[PDB]
Amino acid sequence: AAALADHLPEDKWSAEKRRPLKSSLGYEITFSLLNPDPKSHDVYWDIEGAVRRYVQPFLNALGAAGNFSVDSQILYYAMLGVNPRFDSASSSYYLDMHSLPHVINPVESRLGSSAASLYPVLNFLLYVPELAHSPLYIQDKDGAPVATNAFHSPRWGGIMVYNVDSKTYNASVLPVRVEVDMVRVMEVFLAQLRLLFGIAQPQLPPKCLLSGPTSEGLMTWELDRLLWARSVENLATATTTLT
Amino acid sequence: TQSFSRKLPFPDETHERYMVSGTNVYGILRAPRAASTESLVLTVPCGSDSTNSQAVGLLLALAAHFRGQIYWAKDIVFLVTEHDLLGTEAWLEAYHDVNVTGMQSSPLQGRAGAIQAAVALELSSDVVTSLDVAVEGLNGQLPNLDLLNLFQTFC
Amino acid sequence: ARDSLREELVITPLPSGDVAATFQFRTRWDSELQREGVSHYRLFPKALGQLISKYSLRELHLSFTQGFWRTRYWGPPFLQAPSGAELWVWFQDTVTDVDKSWKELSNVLSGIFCASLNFIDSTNTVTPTASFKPLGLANDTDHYFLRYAVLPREVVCTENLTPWKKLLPCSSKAGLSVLLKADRLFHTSYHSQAVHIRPVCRNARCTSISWELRQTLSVVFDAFITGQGKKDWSLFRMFSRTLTEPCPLASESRVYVDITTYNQDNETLEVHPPPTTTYQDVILGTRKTYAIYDLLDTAMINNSRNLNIQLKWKRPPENEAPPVPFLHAQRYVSGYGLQKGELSTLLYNTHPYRAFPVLLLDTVPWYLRLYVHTLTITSKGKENKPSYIHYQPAQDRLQPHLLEMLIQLPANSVTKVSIQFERALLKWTEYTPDPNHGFYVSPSVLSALVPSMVAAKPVDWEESPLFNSLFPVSDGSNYFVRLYTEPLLVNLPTPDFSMPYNVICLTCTVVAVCYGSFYNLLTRTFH
Amino acid sequence: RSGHTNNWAVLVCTSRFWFNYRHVANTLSVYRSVKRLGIPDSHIVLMLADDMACNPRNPKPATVFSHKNMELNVYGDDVEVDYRSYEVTVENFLRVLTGRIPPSTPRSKRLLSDDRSNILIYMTGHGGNGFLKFQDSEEITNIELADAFEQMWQKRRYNELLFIIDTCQGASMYERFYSPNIMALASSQVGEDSLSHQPDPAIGVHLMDRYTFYVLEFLEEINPASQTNMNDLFQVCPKSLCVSTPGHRTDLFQRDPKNVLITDFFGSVRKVEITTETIKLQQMEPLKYAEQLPVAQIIHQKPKLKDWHPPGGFILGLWALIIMVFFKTY
Numbered sequence A: 001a002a003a004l005a006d007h008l009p010e011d012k013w014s015a016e017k018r019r020p021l022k023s024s025l026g027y028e029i030t031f032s033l034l035n036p037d038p039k040s041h042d043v044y045w046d047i048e049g050a051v052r053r054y055v056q057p058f059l060n061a062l063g064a065a066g067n068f069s070v071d072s073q074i075l076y077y078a079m080l081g082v083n084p085r086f087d088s089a090s091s092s093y094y095l096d097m098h099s100l101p102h103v104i105n106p107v108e109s110r111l112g113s114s115a116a117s118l119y120p121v122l123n124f125l126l127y128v129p130e131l132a133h134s135p136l137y138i139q140d141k142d143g144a145p146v147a148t149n150a151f152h153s154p155r156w157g158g159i160m161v162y163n164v165d166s167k168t169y170n171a172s173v174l175p176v177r178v179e180v181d182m183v184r185v186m187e188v189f190l191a192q193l194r195l196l197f198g199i200a201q202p203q204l205p206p207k208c209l210l211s212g213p214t215s216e217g218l219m220t221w222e223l224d225r226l227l228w229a230r231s232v233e234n235l236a237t238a239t240t241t242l243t
Numbered sequence B: 001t002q003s004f005s006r007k008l009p010f011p012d013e014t015h016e017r018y019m020v021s022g023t024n025v026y027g028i029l030r031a032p033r034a035a036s037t038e039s040l041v042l043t044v045p046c047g048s049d050s051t052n053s054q055a056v057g058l059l060l061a062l063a064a065h066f067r068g069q070i071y072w073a074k075d076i077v078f079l080v081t082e083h084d085l086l087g088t089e090a091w092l093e094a095y096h097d098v099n100v101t102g103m104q105s106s107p108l109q110g111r112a113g114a115i116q117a118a119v120a121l122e123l124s125s126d127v128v129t130s131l132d133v134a135v136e137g138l139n140g141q142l143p144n145l146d147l148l149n150l151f152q153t154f155c
Numbered sequence C: 001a002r003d004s005l006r007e008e009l010v011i012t013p014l015p016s017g018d019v020a021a022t023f024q025f026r027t028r029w030d031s032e033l034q035r036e037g038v039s040h041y042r043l044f045p046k047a048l049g050q051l052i053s054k055y056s057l058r059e060l061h062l063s064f065t066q067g068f069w070r071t072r073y074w075g076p077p078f079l080q081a082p083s084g085a086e087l088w089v090w091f092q093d094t095v096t097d098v099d100k101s102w103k104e105l106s107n108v109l110s111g112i113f114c115a116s117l118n119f120i121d122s123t124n125t126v127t128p129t130a131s132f133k134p135l136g137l138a139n140d141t142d143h144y145f146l147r148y149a150v151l152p153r154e155v156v157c158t159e160n161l162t163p164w165k166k167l168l169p170c171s172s173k174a175g176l177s178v179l180l181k182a183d184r185l186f187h188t189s190y191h192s193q194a195v196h197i198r199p200v201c202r203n204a205r206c207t208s209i210s211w212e213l214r215q216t217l218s219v220v221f222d223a224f225i226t227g228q229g230k231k232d233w234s235l236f237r238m239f240s241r242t243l244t245e246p247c248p249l250a251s252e253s254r255v256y257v258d259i260t261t262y263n264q265d266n267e268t269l270e271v272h273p274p275p276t277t278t279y280q281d282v283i284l285g286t287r288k289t290y291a292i293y294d295l296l297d298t299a300m301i302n303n304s305r306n307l308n309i310q311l312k313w314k315r316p317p318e319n320e321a322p323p324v325p326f327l328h329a330q331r332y333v334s335g336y337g338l339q340k341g342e343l344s345t346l347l348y349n350t351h352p353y354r355a356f357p358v359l360l361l362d363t364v365p366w367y368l369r370l371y372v373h374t375l376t377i378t379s380k381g382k383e384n385k386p387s388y389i390h391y392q393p394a395q396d397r398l399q400p401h402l403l404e405m406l407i408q409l410p411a412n413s414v415t416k417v418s419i420q421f422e423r424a425l426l427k428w429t430e431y432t433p434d435p436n437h438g439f440y441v442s443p444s445v446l447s448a449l450v451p452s453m454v455a456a457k458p459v460d461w462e463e464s465p466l467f468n469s470l471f472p473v474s475d476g477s478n479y480f481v482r483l484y485t486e487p488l489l490v491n492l493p494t495p496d497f498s499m500p501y502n503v504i505c506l507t508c509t510v511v512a513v514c515y516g517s518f519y520n521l522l523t524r525t526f527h
Numbered sequence D: 001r002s003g004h005t006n007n008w009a010v011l012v013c014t015s016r017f018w019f020n021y022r023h024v025a026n027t028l029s030v031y032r033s034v035k036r037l038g039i040p041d042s043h044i045v046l047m048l049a050d051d052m053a054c055n056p057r058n059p060k061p062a063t064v065f066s067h068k069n070m071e072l073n074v075y076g077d078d079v080e081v082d083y084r085s086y087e088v089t090v091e092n093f094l095r096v097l098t099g100r101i102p103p104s105t106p107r108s109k110r111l112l113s114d115d116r117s118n119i120l121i122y123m124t125g126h127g128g129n130g131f132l133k134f135q136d137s138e139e140i141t142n143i144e145l146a147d148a149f150e151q152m153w154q155k156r157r158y159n160e161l162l163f164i165i166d167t168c169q170g171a172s173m174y175e176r177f178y179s180p181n182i183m184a185l186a187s188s189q190v191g192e193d194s195l196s197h198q199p200d201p202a203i204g205v206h207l208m209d210r211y212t213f214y215v216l217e218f219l220e221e222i223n224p225a226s227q228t229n230m231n232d233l234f235q236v237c238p239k240s241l242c243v244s245t246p247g248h249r250t251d252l253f254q255r256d257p258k259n260v261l262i263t264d265f266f267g268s269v270r271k272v273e274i275t276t277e278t279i280k281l282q283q284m285e286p287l288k289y290a291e292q293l294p295v296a297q298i299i300h301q302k303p304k305l306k307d308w309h310p311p312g313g314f315i316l317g318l319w320a321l322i323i324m325v326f327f328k329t330y
């Protein structure tokens, strides 16, 4: 459905079927760590080891469908598009779903002119809220904070809000050395990448099992489905281009 | 400053000058935002008499005003020549570093780039009744008509 | 971590009464940027970090100046750049295609900095034989891997300041980059936006390579434009903003204010906020001293003690100013018509004791046909034969004239090197949309080892302030300076752009009348 | 409810010479509104044929103003020009739209739009009947523009396209469009050509074209999360206010303009999906700096300059045959 997306007739279910990524020879995957205030947070994040231990296996599995150019980046004083509302009930801050479409524009101004190819870039931001709104949460549909504190855009990357706690010291505020749990971050980032390439959950028949998650991250038959869709989409694109 | 001297063919029987020798004094308004590639020349042709003392004052007052402005794309050269036209010829020859009239001078320590336009204010009175433009050059040459149109519109 | 940042602002009151401000943002990375596998960037910008590995670069110097540094009336600059866009790069030995990589790199830099560096073509590009030596560590300067281009008519605005500011770690949000308001930086008589990448060693004993990125911004505030009054030269007056909290990423964040008088050995300039300390050193030629404001000092700048450094400075009386900086040039165009002229560049040696060698590099864009047999170097009224002469001629539309000469400037004297050229007529589809404005002759480069008033010391590039580590000092009693002359506006003869079709008809009609006359004579029999 | 995802923008000023400051101000006002409403710099291909922002003639450097009061600098502190000066040609413009740019062109200087991309294209400058002058030299005609738009649609390089032109007789630049999803605005109609002229005393040249000035004023009052629609922008400039009659054109758009938000082209409201899935990962000798002026080394690097003389082979060869001809005749 995503592969064709132009030869099948359109109806109410026509945009979510065009959500996943276009076919391309390569993909840039930039892991950007957003640090709005280095004065309060001194964020370090094993990103080299994180990539090697979790993304490179996943990207090697996914590499049957194209080359990947994973990079990392730290953006300082990278503010968000909207001010989170302060809840006067739990001493926290929130971002409702309504304001989420307007939250990544200022930072996506920063990510530009930092890519070294014409391939579609997938930006994965790890926002680290400043002390002004240090306990920041994202609310799914009605009040309830989301489990992963993250969201993603159809063909853009994804954004995860990463909160630090238990940072109490004696004297005034110093830059606290914040260590980022790369397992926790890469779980949501690889789930978002899987969703961005259109690999949904296995969509079972009435009775079956799955053998659970694979060490690489995604099942091989899912890779084969991706190659089927890529082949059909590529052939359709080539014939349209030739005519 | 530019020191210039000239051997006239004969005493000219008009200014009693045979061995012309004088100094041109010019100051360059350096266009701040520009790279000093084009220039405009405001010149007062001082002579050996009392005339054009107000034109020098007006030139210096305009230099005082133009200096302090950031909107200059061209340098402004404020040139006070020694003689009515021999000084102007000396400065114009040494500026382009040609020797068209065989007049000797000192090397110019400073230029302002390609000159685009030039104004030759003569004014020997404080108040003025009318302003008399003159557009006819050596060998019958004329300035581009837009300069005179510009003058007439600002009148 | 591995990479460090240090930001510095040096305020120099110029001898003419102007005040020059230079911003330096040096990032040093102890990483292997020359090869692939450095995909993780923290302080060194990813955009520029990728370039070194992708295109095999050793040094990348790209500057975006407006204005011209008046060396005669100002002093010698810490770093000068030509008007327009200057880009010279040293490639690695393992490139094997220097011009293709140069084209790709110029296009990518045009994309990054939003300038027209895609106009850098074989007609603008020049391979200096030995002028632009690498500024970092070099195994051997081959000059086969050096490319150099300049676009004199390349405007710099916040069009180039925004991409330039995006590359800073404290990206114009805190520290010393808050004084970078565009309307105040471009309200000036000189503005520079250079970015420099060069192989700098890791420690005291330079046995390994660490990459340094300098983002410099030199700006000169005119006294009559900006001050025009008796108010002090405050940071607020010149930048419309004081100094708030420093850049937390910066390992060192300092402001240097030059407080040095001449014909006086005491009585420095008065700066209102008592500075942290005083740094006296031989900087270019003279033992000049600075007041230091360490932004990483809570005593100097609290969370609520914003710093507004004030400087009392006005154009000193002529019996109280430095004479002249022992070397300045002045390029101009001789002749007055079209079809012919002379590129002449006076270069002055005002030292009345010491001749010194000067390397003059000229690039002329192949529509001013140079006649090298007309190249004269007088230097005293006598004739001065250059020690080293190199001249590549220009092939129409594919290469410019390059002229490199080692002229020994004799004494306090003026050396007038001149060369005659003839203006070319181009095709009607070869002039710019403003053909009557003219064409730009690129500013000529003037590399010299000017003698110093007092002998300098060998100082490591870590203890020294950022303005004292631009050039790799070699001798000690002589300091290296690279002057740029003015860009020259040369007009070419122009064809009538409104008559391309009538000309074809008229010339073909002359051909046709010849054809008809010869037809009616070679075929018509008399009767 | 629109299906777009990208929200690109191409803003073009085909004018030089600092008395066309009005056109640079038009482009920069559209740019300011678009960048305030969400579209990133990377997705805006801005073209300013001349800076006029901080060229030396500007009384206020690094600023472009919309009004005589000088209180809204459309050339803000955050601006990127992808194509400027001599780069802004009809050739380069059609290259950017059709994708036929030279391969060395970077990302920021191209329109990398896809089938899910909303594109806003704003052209400003001198313009006559069904043609737009590029820097007073060359020409783009409505035929070429329509052909380029068709070529974009053939590859599905836009989802919906909003064309706005602010030139004289600008309603005829969108008179030859056939690509399926394009709606077009224009400052004036086929005929009206009267060009307004009220130069600001402070800034010597004219400020705006009075149509994008009201478009700017209309766009200044909306937020990124605004529900204003295209029907509220189809009457932003009445006949009482701009002398010319601004005419729109919706013969191609499938969607009703009253449902098309103005943020669908001015600004980027991204579709947001809350992620709930999780992958459950297992868990010697020193180096020297170069010598800047090695005077001794660079003199000896060149072979000694000796006066040239012809080789002995040529002199012997030529002289021998000169004598040879002397003997066939004698």
Ligand SMILES: *[C@@H]1O[C@H](CO)[C@@H](O[C@@H]2O[C@H](CO)[C@@H](O[C@@H]3O[C@H](CO)[C@@H](O)[C@H](O)[C@@H]3O)[C@H](O)[C@H]2NC(C)=O)[C@H](O)[C@H]1NC(C)=O
Residues within 6 Å of the ligand: B007, B094, B099, B101, B102, B103, B104, B105
């Ligand atoms: C343009 O050409 C004329 C000649 O056609 C140059 O005039 C010459 O100027 C020199 C000075 O540099 C004169 O030489 C001087 O002669 C006196 C007396 O003999 C001597 O005491 C001085 O030491 C000096 O040598 C020379 O006489 C004079 N020639 C003529 C015919 O008057 C003129 O200098 C050229 N223009 C420029 C800008 O150089």
Ligand SMILES: *[C@@H]1O[C@H](CO)[C@@H](O)[C@H](O)[C@H]1NC(C)=O
Residues within 6 Å of the ligand: A025, A026, A067
């Ligand atoms: C992807 O990587 C493989 C491995 O070397 C290479 O052969 C291929 O050319 C790459 N793809 C592209 C589009 O360059």
Ligand SMILES: *[C@@H]1O[C@H](CO)[C@@H](O)[C@H](O)[C@H]1NC(C)=O
Residues within 6 Å of the ligand: C298, C299, C300, C301, C302, C304, C305
């Ligand atoms: C600033 O810092 C030092 C010590 O904290 C001192 O000058 C002063 O107490 C602080 N506050 C102000 C307002 O200067």
Ligand SMILES: [Ca+2]
Residues within 6 Å of the ligand: D041, D042, D043, D044, D045, D046, D080, D081, D082, D108, D109
């Ligand atoms: Ca852009």
